[PDB]
Ligand binder design. Structure first.
Ligand SMILES: NC(=O)c1ccc[n+]([C@@H]2O[C@H](COP(=O)([O-])OP(=O)(O)OC[C@H]3O[C@@H](n4cnc5c(N)ncnc54)[C@H](O)[C@@H]3O)[C@@H](O)[C@H]2O)c1
Ligand SMILES: NC(=O)c1ccc[n+]([C@@H]2O[C@H](COP(=O)([O-])OP(=O)(O)OC[C@H]3O[C@@H](n4cnc5c(N)ncnc54)[C@H](O)[C@@H]3O)[C@@H](O)[C@H]2O)c1
Ligand SMILES: O=c1ccn([C@@H]2O[C@H](COP(=O)(O)OP(=O)(O)O)[C@@H](O)[C@H]2O)c(=O)[nH]1
Ligand SMILES: O=c1ccn([C@@H]2O[C@H](COP(=O)(O)OP(=O)(O)O)[C@@H](O)[C@H]2O)c(=O)[nH]1
Lengths: 367, 366
């Protein structure tokens, strides 16, 4: 069911996996708008017309059914209202917006709130205003488990409607965005879906795209980066942020969901909003928690990395990183029931293997 | 305590009363920044150097202690970076910011959320960024009872500062996010902030020269008094919703005089100015400002009838979306910590000042 999709932040980690799924599993037209602030100012990995061509060229073998599928790339900031307007006009009519751009280092948001409120909140504001101006009535928003925080001061899978008590400015910025999108449904008829990803991880089976460790603030990429340093010719120990949490082993528990499963959820979300009609209205705004429903502590994740890489990965216990909730695991019944979401990755072992395959073949990232 | 104060939205209804209190009851320097979007693009009422000299000229009798006091006026949008930065630079150093600008029609925020999220949220964001850039560490923010919304399922009692926040409108959401942004700036940059939740602002300065004119107003009392004016200077007074979970079915509110709100800001300014390195836990504070008395829409109209002597015919209508059923304030902390002492209690006295201003201003300030 062809549809022209505008993917903000599409050159990023999760965005690249979503775009690839759009290009290989759908007939939608893809337009990416990214400032490249989260990609070191480069876009060699983006599946533009030229990049896709070079890939099919440099390599030999049966031409894939998606060999001619590519996305357009518009480089700029979504807060630059002029730039944004030009993108909607030149690539219009835009049927749906998938808003993935943001700053997402929870620890950094606590130290520099304004950087996060500006980019995260003003960014979604500008998109919503552009959608209204250009008659676009469908949006899929990248939310987070960070909107939940710790229980109001049993730890079990978090439901979509659990209380929202953000433990960081990052979480607050995602939460206000959901409120804004919700209010636009009632006021302007904008159909929106907020997908709360939990801990995104893994890499596409092809092993060519993923989250490089250099400059990363996330657990697994950092662990694998320590291995990339243990592999190199002779403190390289793996830092554990906080061991005094209200969890079984004292370290934070998270739900690691594969980026390819997150990608398929967006395709299902797009089909859902596209089928909504005027009688649905109460269904114009919906939220879904995306996770495997299984949790792993920081210690357990490191142990899986050790068994996946075959390396020692010496650790070192440190103090808590401000902004971190003790436990964040997802209950995804709504996503499974309503969207028909069917995650292919369940164990961290299989996920970790795809992350390692990508990292171990990219000592310098995409560079 | 000679402090230079930047008052955003200072040309407005509540801002004008706060500025007058600053000029007559303090020795602070006042700089007003306002786009005049809420004042019909005019500022004849603002107590600038010129406007104040005209009052003096027309006045007969000995000069008051505050005869020559005036405020500077910078006309522009706080969301305009170049403009805001220029104001901080030319009038600097700015010691404290009193952020009063915003759009505040609860009913309109439900119909047009983006207009409110933009102005209300981006406005406070720019001010906080400017404060950081220009080394300003003190801010007093105009919050609202709208951040509370309805109670989660009893006994309807005055609302405590830490009651659950369940905004019933985008307007309430915009005020709430501003409080969380200010709070996070305390922890991160050492910015000392106070969020004053005004409840239903009403009344007018005893002088009878400034207030909220009915033409273009979305608020209850100004609209009621406007119905009295139109008849003299349907045409029936509309009651929005009569099926609310209240004693008489209409919304209950806490009407607090703008002059009492003004004195609370002066007390708030003193509170943040006295904060030091040891008072980290006090860098972010919130206070609910109300009389603790509630009046339903029916009761307010009843008071207006007696105050004006006009029949004020009515027509019951449906609910205005975005309205909580009950909003009355418990002001224990404001009284205990700031030493706030409201001079107006009952609505009769308040209504009297509102009527005095309106009846003498058939065309507003025009
Ligand atoms: N990574 C996770 O575990 C996780 C979990 C929950 C939610 N999320 C959310 O998913 C989205 C994507 O995350 P990611 O891991 O792919 O991160 P990422 O940084 O790789 O992707 C974000 C992309 O957005 C771009 N961007 C940022 N601000 C922009 C702006 N103002 N204008 C244009 N482009 C801009 C960046 O250049 C980057 O390419 C974000 O909204 C993030 O908050 C991520
Ligand atoms: N009136 C009430 O009952 C009430 C209750 C609770 C909270 N508040 C808050 O108190 C404050 C003042 O309310 P008021 O009744 O005096 O309203 P008002 O409209 O008279 O005052 C607001 C002033 O801010 C200005 N303004 C708006 N956006 C601006 C911008 N972007 N840049 C520069 N100036 C801008 C307007 O021109 C206006 O002069 C607002 O923040 C309002 O939300 C009012
Ligand atoms: O070097 C690191 C990086 C992260 N973490 C922890 O691993 C968990 C996941 O952190 P991440 O930044 O990868 O994602 P988040 O849960 O903040 O969205 C959290 O408890 C972090 O404190 C850690 O112990 N050491
Ligand atoms: O013409 C009007 C205007 C307002 N109201 C009601 O009076 C109460 C106060 O409304 P207002 O806009 O003056 O202030 P708010 O409580 O929204 O901050 C609310 O229940 C309104 O619905 C009314 O019944 N008729």
């Amino acid at each position: 069911s062809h549809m022209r999709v505008l993917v903000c932040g599409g050159a990023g980690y999760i965005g690249s996996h979503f775009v690839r799924a759009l290009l290989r599993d759908t007939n939608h037209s893809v337009v990416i708008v990214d400032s490249l602030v989260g990609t070191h100012g480069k876009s060699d990995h983006v599946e533009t017309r030229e990049n896709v061509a070079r890939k099919l060229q440099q390599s030999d073998g049966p031409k894939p059914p998606w060999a001619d599928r590519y996305a357009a790339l518009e480089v700029g900031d979504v807060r630059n209202e002029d730039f944004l307007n030009g993108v909607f006009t030149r690539h219009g009519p835009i049927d749906a917006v998938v808003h993935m751009c943001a700053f997402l280092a929870v620890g950094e948001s606590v130290r520099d709130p304004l950087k996060y409120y500006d980019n995260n909140v003003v960014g979604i504001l500008r998109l919503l205003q552009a959608m209204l101006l250009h008659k676009c009535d469908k949006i899929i928003f990248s939310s987070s488990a960070a909107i939940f925080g710790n229980p109001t001061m049993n730890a079990e899978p978090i439901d979509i409607n659990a209380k929202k008590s953000p433990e960081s400015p990052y979480g607050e910025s995602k939460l206000i965005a959901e409120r804004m999108i919700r209010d636009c449904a009632e006021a302007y008829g904008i159909k929106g879906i907020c997908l709360r990803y939990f801990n995104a991880c893994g890499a596409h089976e092809d092993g060519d795209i993923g989250e490089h460790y250099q400059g990363s603030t996330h657990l697994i990429p950092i662990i694998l980066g320590r291995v990339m340093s243990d592999i190199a010719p002779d403190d390289k120990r793996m830092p554990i942020f906080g061991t005094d949490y209200p969890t079984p082993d004292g370290t934070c528990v998270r739900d690691y969901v594969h980026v390819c499963d997150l990608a398929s959820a967006h395709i299902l979300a797009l089909d859902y909003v596209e089928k909504l009609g005027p009688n649905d209205k109460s269904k114009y705004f919906s939220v879904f928690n995306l996770g495997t429903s299984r949790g792993y502590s920081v210690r357990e994740v490191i142990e899986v990395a050790r068994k996946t890489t075959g390396h020692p990965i010496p650790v070192r216990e440190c103090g808590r990183r401000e902004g971190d909730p003790a436990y964040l695991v997802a209950a995804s019944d709504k996503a499974r029931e309503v969207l028909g979401w069917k995650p292919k990755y369940d164990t961290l072992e299989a996920i970790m293997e795809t992350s390692w395959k990508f990292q171990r073949t990219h000592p310098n990232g995409y560079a």
